[PDB]
């Protein structure tokens, strides 16, 4: 009797059924309740007079006691989706059940490795998110008025904050820190520089990626046509703690000979650096003068102590990679920038890059009179940038009514075209669950889903990518003419949660029952 | 061809709930009409009740079936909104469930079935309003005759001539014009043994449920006084710990007496500061209301006291009088006190009812409190319920004006219009319009069965004469045949038939929405 | 006593039952073996909820009545302190030896011969593996820094750490080196403290060179930072093994108050003792006072006026790590304090972590200490425990890399090279032990076949392919592909396993396989 105290392990045959059929039975509770035309469920207790009827997916799943240990996993997935947004919990559980329903066919009559099935979804979901981006529309129209509406909202976010001293200058910095990105609005694309000895109104916006530390001793302060390499290694005194070692040598000069041999091993790595044809090198650790002197003859400037976030933000602006090792010469993702200029602000030397390759980003340099003005401004600035970024990601919608679900199917079928051997059925199974979403929505409407979904697939396959399902008239019409749209953030949340839920469940060859609390 | 797979089998859950709910409607079906069959229910405690009331049977039936319990809520809204027809709405609900069984056998999804009933219910209301007899609240002739004929089924008969205008004049004051639905809970019927039926008083201000102080010193009457609600209690000192009166000395009798009278005087003094001469204390069985020592203090201050005020009237007195409930003596203020012209105890045999006039409040509106008197206890009881039905029928005219002759006339008129309209529809819905009108014929069919008349024969004679007359053809129990229901003084408001169709359409709609039954604790 | 419900086994019976008992638990962990395995949900009886595939955590939570599988828990408990990451490797290897032992029993070989058969076969495989082994420090010094980072990356690739792994890879290398000496090569898990709390993210995790103690500096008005005070010696802290209170005799313990007179005097005497005990801290020059027991309200009043922060309720074990890291002494009494017995650190400050209300303290040191506290942050409690044990697994891998500079190439290539060498030498060794040596080579083939099944490859086809690449072409290390890559030859990927780590696995697997064969009888008493 393994485990014990209500803990047990399911049989490999029953665990696959408990993770699939057992999870579908939980998804079947919210299956018929999906959509505005969905049905209702009954929740009855032992007293039987306390019961209630509701269509809420979060209420039905949490109220019903689940003895299936695999069903408790879907409860945790529902909590992750509820944290993102309070709507769409029903659609995630139903879509996850459709992925597991085809997964039973991806094992029995298929014989495909389960991790490859997940990797088959990771490649299919990537094409699904890309298809939603191409078909994405927005209510941002009349952007000329929308760009003006952002600077007024930024002023409202500055209330109660010490930045309220000047609203016009600070709201312009926050507004230009978003619209000028033309891409991801995450704070990783915005660098904050906190300095002393000035006024808050003297702050300015610079897209040149200003970083505090300098590079080189006798090296020049200007670099033209820079080639940036990103790597992490210790070129100066490795094994940071040498205390306790015993070096057996006949004389002290032989102890330094091993250090010279270590310096000879430095040329092995330095030679691989010169094979890349770079005038600039990035390192998180320090570098001793001898390997740095060899960089002077090769014309390589070394920026040191970039930490990690500073390295990742440098790879995004210059289009580089964070890899710390050299697998093979002339194979890598390299960045570059037009001009590297060293400036001085606040009695400290700074570095201002210029002309980064495909660079889209900004660096907000906050100049305060003390540490209290710098710390409270950065926390309040990110709150103002979060409100401005909320209007960019939200109110941006996509065509609904079965459209977006079928449009993703066409992109996944395109991914199912060029694919390796074992993932051909795994990618195709993902497109089947995408077509089951409008199928179930047509189930509760009272119409024929097999007729509407089949005609919807053949319609979008050749031309007419904007068509969708009309539940009112029971036919196929243009979604742009009917004005049926659904949020893009809701689509990304359901697809991401379905991939995370399938990542844990498909790897299951056995189920460990949780301990009751 | 290729259609949806239908892997799940939700129909076995819905069909089991429809058949189980249809047996409940068929059981109540025999209770329709005054000649209907009475149903008996024996409670687990051993009590046996007998009555034809649909709302009473479904309440004491202790139905374990969840869908059949919804008929209790539908009958509750039937009595709350319309006030009559709790049996007819259950039959109409079961008639739609019985017709839905043939709809599910044809392979029709319940969404189209539910959406067709809602579309048929909205159009059935317009059919009645166009064929209805238009009446207004400005005409008091039809309001008295409608309430007089509704009381012919009650103990009061000859005295109902004076009872009808009392209910009419009470509604005309609270109805205003555009107020639409007016809460009947603002009308409080106070029943008390003694007197007679012919003795009634409108008393627009308010009426209490209790008597006045019967001890020594009770004023029982006060003029130009203020009224307020007090949740506090006038008592000698009573700390939260255990207290007892132990007097071992001759001098302690005067010490404790003066100590209790001093604490009672401080309570009576704070009441005099706000000049409140009428005190209403919430009824509590824990301690007393006012001590006998404090009764002599308030008698000198000329402050009337009415105690044992029920908790149900606390919310009512805070509305009609415009006052506010006051928990403690510190919360007692003059701003929460109303100004009454005269507060007196009316002397009657075995009654002694206290009334109040001239609430003198702008925020308060014309609430109604009517006194009911009678010698027998069975009189003042049924009289209160009989006036409720008289107020509901008149209130139905306030929300939606017009009245429809009963006896199956509105059920046949809708079926005749939907029969020709069903040919104008297309698709699956066209078959539902014929099944919806077929379920409407269950109500007039039951009226003929419970009356002993031939089921089919009476229904055919009404539809045969329906080509000449319109709304004047119906079932008459008094004549035991087919005749004019308008000349027999049988009248029904339009809101009853409107709510009966609306609630039954939403009920059956919500019935088909449950495809599964799961245990959740 | 307890005659009824007594189980008894014999030779002709238990020998078959002992093999079936091991195959049941073995097949459970074969699904979680490798980076492509399964992460299992586990809840400890103490209330900790976590999800991990680590065999040492999974097998420790297993409670079962099979006596053969209990020996798997006993070996994993001793291996968890030595390595802890080889739990899944040894049990499957030990079960492979038992599966081959059952075949030798059917051939008429005694179980004691199989014990000596696998013993001589294991010692032979060690010499063959050492000849094909490669060294790091004697080869390239800069790759030694790259090997330590990418070896932890292999264990951190199956966790959410994989995004931020670059920082935790350096934190795992420094934490091991600080608590060890290069010549001694001794690393104790008790020297590295693993802690974590809710809030923040994993990118904000800091490596601390000293204790933590989870203190807010008692009264909030006390300063949150401690300065060196104009070039003093380190930062002096007081360690007291006695609580802060007026001293009482052990003979009486009773205090009699006759009236307000003796009441006001005794109240001042207790305050006078508070002034005498704080002066001993001032005379010794201790900035912060660390005691095992709580302090009174008047205690924080006098300590605040002199700018002397307080520390309350420190365990007895935590007091030992403070004096070792700060080079202090344990002072039993109050008056025995002095500048030589006070712990000297680099600085003391209170660093607020995210929105967490704990507001702990950080005591660091510039010089190398013997105590290192690894603190991990995360947005969820399950994320903290996941990144904590993932970082602890990196500490164990680096521990064996610095313990032996020579390493072997993993990914299944180590078991194939050890199998082909013993199988060739099995024919040269005659006698009954010839089959014991052939069965040992076939038992080593279970590891690459198990990894091949979990990777989606033919276990027989891939194993036979690797044997041809290491024979007809040239002798090298080419293993099965655990993680997605373009082709074979993990040696090109620089995937290494410690030689002392792999040798420790085959010794414990052989030592346990012999012990299982040394038990032919199982006696289990009932419940009275």
From Swiss-Prot, chain A:
InterPro entries: Chap_CCT_beta, Chaperone_TCP-1, Chaperonin_TCP-1_CS, Cpn60/GroEL/TCP-1, GroEL-like_apical_dom_sf, GROEL-like_equatorial_sf, TCP-1-like_intermed_sf
Keyword ATP-binding: yes
Alphabetical UniProt keywords: Acetylation, ATP-binding, Chaperone, Cytoplasm, Nucleotide-binding
GO terms for biological process, alphabetical: chaperone mediated protein folding independent of cofactor; protein folding
Signal peptide stretch: none
GO-annotated cellular components: chaperonin-containing T-complex; cytoplasm
Location(s), subcellular: Cytoplasm
Molecular function per GO: ATP binding; ATP hydrolysis activity; ATP-dependent protein folding chaperone; unfolded protein binding
Disulphide bridges: none
Origin: domain of life: Eukaryota
SUPFAM superfamilies: GroEL apical domain-like, GroEL equatorial domain-like, GroEL-intermediate domain like
PROSITE patterns: TCP1_1 (PS00750), TCP1_2 (PS00751), TCP1_3 (PS00995)
Family stated for the protein in its record: Belongs to the TCP-1 chaperonin family.
Subunit structure comment from the entry: Heterooligomeric complex of about 850 to 900 kDa that forms two stacked rings, 12 to 16 nm in diameter. Interacts with PLP2; this interaction leads to inhibition of CCT complex mediated actin folding.
Cross-referenced NCBIfam families: chap_CCT_beta
Role description: Molecular chaperone; assists the folding of proteins upon ATP hydrolysis. Known to play a role, in vitro, in the folding of actin and tubulin. In yeast may play a role in mitotic spindle formation.
Name listed for the protein in its UniProt record: T-complex protein 1 subunit beta
From Swiss-Prot, chain B:
Subcellular location: Cytoplasm
PROSITE patterns in the cross-refs: TCP1_1 (PS00750), TCP1_2 (PS00751), TCP1_3 (PS00995)
Entry-linked Pfam families: Cpn60_TCP1
Subunit structure: Heterooligomeric complex of about 850 to 900 kDa that forms two stacked rings, 12 to 16 nm in diameter.
NCBIfam families reported for this sequence: chap_CCT_delta, thermosome_alpha, thermosome_beta
Miscellaneous information on this protein: Present with 5530 molecules/cell in log phase SD medium.
Protein name: T-complex protein 1 subunit delta
Organism: Saccharomyces cerevisiae (strain ATCC 204508 / S288c) (Baker's yeast)
Source taxonomy: Eukaryota, Fungi, Dikarya, Ascomycota, Saccharomycotina
Curated annotation (Swiss-Prot), chain C:
GO molecular function: ATP binding; ATP hydrolysis activity; ATP-dependent protein folding chaperone; unfolded protein binding
Record's keyword terms, sorted: ATP-binding, Chaperone, Cytoplasm, Nucleotide-binding
Recorded superkingdom: Eukaryota
Task performed by this protein: Molecular chaperone; assists the folding of proteins upon ATP hydrolysis. Known to play a role, in vitro, in the folding of actin and tubulin. In yeast may play a role in mitotic spindle formation.
Family (UniProt): Belongs to the TCP-1 chaperonin family.
Name of the protein this chain belongs to: T-complex protein 1 subunit epsilon
Localization per record: Cytoplasm
GO cellular component, one term: chaperonin-containing T-complex
Short name of any one Pfam family annotated for the protein: Cpn60_TCP1
NCBIfam families on file: chap_CCT_epsi (TIGR02343), thermosome_alpha (NF041082), thermosome_beta (NF041083)
Subunit structure: Heterooligomeric complex of about 850 to 900 kDa that forms two stacked rings, 12 to 16 nm in diameter.
Species, as recorded: Saccharomyces cerevisiae (strain ATCC 204508 / S288c)
Principal localisation: cytoplasm
């Amino acid at each position: 009797q393994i485990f014990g105290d209500q803990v047990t392990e399911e049989r490999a045959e029953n665990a696959r059924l408990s993770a699939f059929v057992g999870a579908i039975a939980v998804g079947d509770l919210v299956k018929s309740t999906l959509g505005p035309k969905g049905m209702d469920k009954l929740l009855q207790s032992a007293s039987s007079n306390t019961c209630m009827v509701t269509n809420d997916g979060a209420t039905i799943l949490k109220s019903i006691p689940l003895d299936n240990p695999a069903a408790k996993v879907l409860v945790n997935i529902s909590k992750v989706q509820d944290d993102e947004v309070g709507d769409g919990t029903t659609s995630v559980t139903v879509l996850s059940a459709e992925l597991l329903r085809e997964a039973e066919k991806l094992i029995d009559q298929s014989k495909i490795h389960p991790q490859t099935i997940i990797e088959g979804y990771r490649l299919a979901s990537a094409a699904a998110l890309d298809a939603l981006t191409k078909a994405a529309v927005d209510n941002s129209h009349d952007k000329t008025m929308f760009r003006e509406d952002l600077i007024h909202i930024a002023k409202t976010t500055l209330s109660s904050k010490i930045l309220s001293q000047d609203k016009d200058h600070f709201a312009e910095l926050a507004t230009n820190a978003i619209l000028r990105l033309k891409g991801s609005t995450n704070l990783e694309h915005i660098q904050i520089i906190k300095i002393l000895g000035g006024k808050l109104s003297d702050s300015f916006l610079d897209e040149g990626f200003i970083l505090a530390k300098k590079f080189g001793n006798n090296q020049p302060k200007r670099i033209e046509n820079a080639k940036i390499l990103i790597a992490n290694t210790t070129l100066d005194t490795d094994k940071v703690k040498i205390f306790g070692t015993k070096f057996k040598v006949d004389s002290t000069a032989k102890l330094a000979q091993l250090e010279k041999a270590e310096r000879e091993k430095m040329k092995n790595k330095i030679a691989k650096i010169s094979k890349f044809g770079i005038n600039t090198f990035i390192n998180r650790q320090l570098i001793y003068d001898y390997p740095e002197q060899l960089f002077t003859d090769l014309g390589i400037n070394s920026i040191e102590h970039a930490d990690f976030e500073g390295v990742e933000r440098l790879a995004l602006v210059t289009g580089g990679e964070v890899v710390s090792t050299f697998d093979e010469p002339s194979k890598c993702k390299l960045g570059e920038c037009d001009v590297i200029e060293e400036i001085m602000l606040g009695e400290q030397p700074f570095l201002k890059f210029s002309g980064c390759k495909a660079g889209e980003a900004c660096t907000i340099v906050l100049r305060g009179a003390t540490d209290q003005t710098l710390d409270e401004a950065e926390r309040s600035l990110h709150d103002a940038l979060s409100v401005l970024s909320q209007t960019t990601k939200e109110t941006r919608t996509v065509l609904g009514g079965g459209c977006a679900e079928m449009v993703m199917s066409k992109a996944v079928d395109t991914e199912a075209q060029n694919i390796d051997g074992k993932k051909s059925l795994a990618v195709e199974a993902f497109a089947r669950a995408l077509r089951q979403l409008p199928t179930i929505l047509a189930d509760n409407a009272g119409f024929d889903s097999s007729e509407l979904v089949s005609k919807l697939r053949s319609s979008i396959y050749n031309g007419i990518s904007t068509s969708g399902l009309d539940l009112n008239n029971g036919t196929i019409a243009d979604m742009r003419q009917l004005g049926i749209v659904e949020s893009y953030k809701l689509k990304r949340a359901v697809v991401s949660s379905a991939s995370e839920a399938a990542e844990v469940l498909l790897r299951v060859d056995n189920i460990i029952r949780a301990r009751p609390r | 061809n290729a259609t949806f797979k239908n892997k799940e089998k939700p129909q076995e859950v819905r069909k089991a709930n429809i058949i189980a709910a249809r047996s409940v409607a068929d059981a109540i079906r025999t209770s329709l009409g005054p000649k209907g069959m009475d149903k008996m229910i024996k409670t687990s405690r051993g009590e046996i009740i007998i009555s034809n009331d649909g709302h009473t049977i479904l309440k004491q039936m202790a139905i374990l079936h969840p869908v059949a319990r919804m008929l209790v809520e539908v009958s509750a809204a039937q009595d709350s909104e319309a006030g009559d027809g709790t049996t007819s709405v259950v039959i109409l609900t079961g008639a739609l469930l019985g017709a839905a069984e043939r709809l599910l056998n044809k392979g029709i999804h319940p969404t189209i079935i539910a959406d067709s009933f809602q579309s048929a219910a909205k159009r059935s209301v317009d059919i009645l309003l166009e064929m209805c007899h238009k009446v207004s609240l400005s005409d008091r002739e039809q309001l008295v005759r409608a309430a007089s004929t509704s009381l012919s089924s009650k103990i009061v008969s000859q005295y109902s001539s004076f009872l009808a205008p009392l209910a009419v004049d009470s509604v005309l004051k609270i109805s205003d014009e555009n107020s639409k639905n007016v809460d009947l809970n603002d009308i409080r019927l106070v029943k008390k043994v003694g007197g007679t039926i012919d003795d009634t008083e409108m008393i627009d201000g308010v009426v209490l449920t209790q008597t006045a102080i019967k001890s020594a010193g009770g004023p029982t009457r006060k003029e130009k006084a203020k009224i307020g609600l007090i949740q506090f209690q006038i008592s000698p000192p009573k700390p939260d710990t255990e207290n007892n009166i132990i007097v071992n000395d001759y001098r302690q009798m005067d010490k404790i007496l003066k100590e209790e009278r001093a604490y009672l005087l401080n309570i009576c003094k704070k009441i005099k500061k706000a000049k409140c001469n009428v005190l209403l204390i919430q009824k509590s069985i824990l301690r007393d209301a006012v001590n006998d020592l404090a009764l002599h203090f308030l008698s000198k201050l000329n402050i009337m006291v009415v105690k044992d005020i029920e908790r149900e009237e606390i919310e009512f007195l805070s509305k009609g009088l415009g006052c506010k409930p006051i928990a403690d003596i510190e919360l007692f203020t003059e701003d929460r006190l109303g100004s009454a012209d005269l507060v007196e105890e009316i002397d009657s045999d075995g009654s002694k009812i206290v009334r109040v006039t001239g609430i003198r409040n702008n925020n308060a509106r014309p609430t109604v409190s009517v006194v009911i008197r009678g010698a027998n206890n069975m009189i003042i009881d049924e009289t209160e319920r009989s006036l409720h039905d008289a107020l509901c029928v008149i209130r139905c005219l306030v929300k939606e004006r017009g009245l429809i002759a009963g006896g199956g006339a509105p059920e046949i008129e809708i079926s005749r219009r939907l029969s020709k309209e069903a040919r104008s529809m297309e698709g699956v819905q066209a078959f539902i319009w014929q099944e919806f009108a077929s379920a409407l014929e269950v109500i007039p069919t039951t009226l003929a069965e419970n009356a002993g008349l031939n089921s089919i024969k009476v229904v055919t004679e009404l539809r045969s004469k329906h080509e000449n007359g319109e709304l004047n053809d119906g079932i008459s129990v008094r004549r035991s045949g087919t005749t004019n229901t308008y000349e027999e003084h049988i009248l029904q408001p339009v809101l009853v038939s409107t709510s009966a169709i609306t609630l039954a359409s939403e009920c059956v709609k919500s019935i088909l929405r449950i495809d599964d039954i799961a245990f959740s604790r | 006593k307890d005659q009824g419900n007594k189980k008894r086994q014999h030779g002709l019976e238990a020998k078959k039952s002992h093999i079936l008992a091991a195959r049941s638990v073995a097949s459970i962990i074969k699904t979680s073996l490798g980076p492509r395995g399964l992460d299992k949900i586990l809840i400890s009886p103490d209330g900790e909820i976590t999800i991990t595939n680590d065999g040492a955590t999974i097998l420790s939570q297993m409670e079962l009545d099979n006596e053969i599988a209990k020996l798997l828990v006993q070996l994993s408990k001793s291996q968890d302190d030595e390595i802890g990451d080889g739990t899944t490797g040894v049990v499957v290897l030990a079960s492979a030896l038992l599966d081959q032992a059952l075949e030798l029993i059917q051939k008429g070989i005694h179980p004691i011969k199989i014990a000596n058969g696998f013993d001589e076969a294991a010692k032979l495989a060690i010499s063959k593996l050492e000849e094909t082994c490669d060294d790091i420090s004697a080869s390239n010094d800069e790759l030694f820094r790259d090997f330590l980072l990418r070896a932890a990356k292999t264990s951190l690739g199956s966790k959410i750490v994989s995004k931020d792994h670059d920082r935790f890879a350096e934190m795992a290398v420094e934490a091991v080196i600080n608590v060890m000496d290069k010549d001694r090569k001794d690393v104790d898990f008790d020297l590295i403290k693993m802690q974590g709390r809710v809030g923040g993210s994993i990118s904000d995790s800091k490596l601390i060179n000293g204790v933590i103690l989870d203190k807010d500096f008692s009264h909030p008005q006390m300063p949150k930072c401690v300065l060196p005070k104009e070039g003093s010696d380190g930062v002096k802290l007081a360690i007291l093994t006695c609580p802060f209170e007026p001293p009482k005799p052990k003979t009486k313990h009773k205090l009699d108050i006759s009236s307000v007179e003796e009441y006001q005097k005794l109240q001042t005497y207790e305050q006078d003792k508070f002034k005498e005990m704080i002066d001993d801290v001032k005379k010794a020059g201790a900035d912060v006072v660390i005691c095992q027991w709580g302090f009174d309200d008047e205690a924080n009043h006098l300590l605040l006026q002199n700018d002397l922060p307080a520390v309350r309720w420190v365990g007895g074990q935590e007091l030992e790590h403070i004096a070792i890291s700060t080079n202090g002494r344990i002072v039993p009494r109050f008056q025995d304090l002095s500048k030589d017995k006070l712990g000297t650190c680099s600085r003391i400050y209170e660093q607020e972590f995210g929105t967490t209300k704990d507001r702990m303290l950080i005591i660091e040191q510039s010089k190398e200490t013997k105590t290192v506290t690894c603190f991990v942050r995360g947005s969820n409690k399950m994320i903290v425990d996941e990144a904590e044990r993932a970082l602890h697994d990196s500490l164990c891998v680096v521990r064996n890399l610095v313990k032996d500079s020579r390493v072997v190439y993993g990914g299944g290539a180590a078991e194939v090279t050890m199998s082909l060498a013993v199988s060739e030498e099995a024919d040269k060794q005659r006698g009954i032990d010839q089959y014991a040596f052939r069965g040992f080579a076939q038992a080593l083939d279970t590891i690459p076949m198990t990894l091949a099944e979990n990777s989606g490859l033919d276990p027989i086809g891939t194993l036979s392919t690797l044997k041809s690449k290491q024979l007809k072409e040239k002798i090298s290390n080419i293993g099965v592909d655990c993680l997605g890559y373009g082709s074979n030859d993990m040696k090109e990927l620089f995937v290494v396993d410690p030689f002392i780590g792999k040798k420790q696995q085959i010794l414990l697997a052989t030592q346990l396989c012999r012990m299982i064969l040394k038990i032919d009888n199982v006696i289990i008493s009932g419940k009275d």
